[PDB]
């Protein structure tokens, strides 16, 4: 009977930085995905392995909603098999992803006239993330052969960089809020079904 708390995910006042992407477990509730899809709200609503209007027919043990903010021209990296700073170092989907990627322009919420420096992304990392891996460390990144002794300096960079989101002409540079839905089946009774 209880509707799934999608409002808390999509309409959260604050969204996470992509390097510190949030995960919310959805369980024991009724999910209406078609109400989300049958709207003018989302500039990306891409599902992998399933059509969006078929989700209401299925039942899962849990649903996970991962959410964060990136640039509009980075939304393309939130897909299987992509590369670039976001896919490589911030949020990585597996090659065999089944699930949905939902995005919408959040300029009015997340940009500031002088720039919103609270949203960050990881620019440097010793290796690429594995799928669904998360890295929130802030150790100084050693880009050369001199060790950094935990202090930024020559070839020693703080690994996170700010987006500084501003209300620009091109929407590609504006912030977009992203929700990634993934659907989990365990050897256990389902707890998240569509309407009857």
């Amino acid at each position, epitope marked *: 009977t209880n509707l799934c708390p999608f409002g808390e995910v999509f309409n959260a006042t604050r969204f996470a930085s992509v390097y510190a992407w949030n995960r919310k477990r959805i369980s024991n509730c009724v999910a209406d995905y078609s109400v989300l899809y*049958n709207s*003018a709200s989302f500039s990306t609503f891409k599902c992998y392995g399933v059509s969006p209007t078929k989700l209401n027919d299925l039942c899962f043990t849990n649903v996970y909603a991962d959410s964060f903010v990136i640039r509009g021209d980075e939304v393309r990296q939130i897909a299987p098999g992509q590369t670039g700073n976001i896919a490589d170092y911030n949020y990585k989907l597996p090659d065999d992803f089944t699930g949905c990627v*939902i995005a919408w322009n959040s300029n009015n919420l997340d940009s500031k006239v002088g720039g919103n420096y609270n949203y960050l992304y990881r620019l440097f990392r010793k290796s690429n993330l594995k799928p669904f891996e998360r890295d929130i460390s802030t150790e100084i990144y050693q880009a050369g052969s001199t060790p950094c002794n935990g202090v930024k300096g020559f070839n020693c960079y703080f690994p996170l960089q700010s987006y500084g989101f501003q209300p620009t002409y091109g929407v590609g540079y504006q912030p977009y809020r992203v929700v990634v839905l993934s659907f989990e089946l365990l050897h256990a009774p389902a707890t998240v079904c569509g309407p009857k």
Partner: nanobody
Amino acid sequence: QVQLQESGGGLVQPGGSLRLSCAASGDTLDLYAIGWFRQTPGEEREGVSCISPSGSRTNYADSVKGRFTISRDNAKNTVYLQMNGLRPEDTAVYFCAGSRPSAHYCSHYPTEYDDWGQGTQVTV
């Protein structure tokens, strides 16, 4: 993802008409929005018209409002752009592009589209 191919471009006298076609191969168009963009030499692509996956929302740039009409045929997996009252300002390479947004969404923003055609030349 689809592959898109534009057709129907060519030379036209000022005041005439053209009907561009955007044929999709691979996927069906059921889940795709389609947008029409144009690009003059050395310039940036200007969104001109779009249609949502549902076909319920069509948006037009102010420069073409009233003279251009976009439409979709899911059975043929083709989207059309009817161009009436063509002025020499409308001369450009015309591209169609595809995206998978929510059912009633479509924009004129190039960065919100994934799949692009090669374009066809319209000369007024």
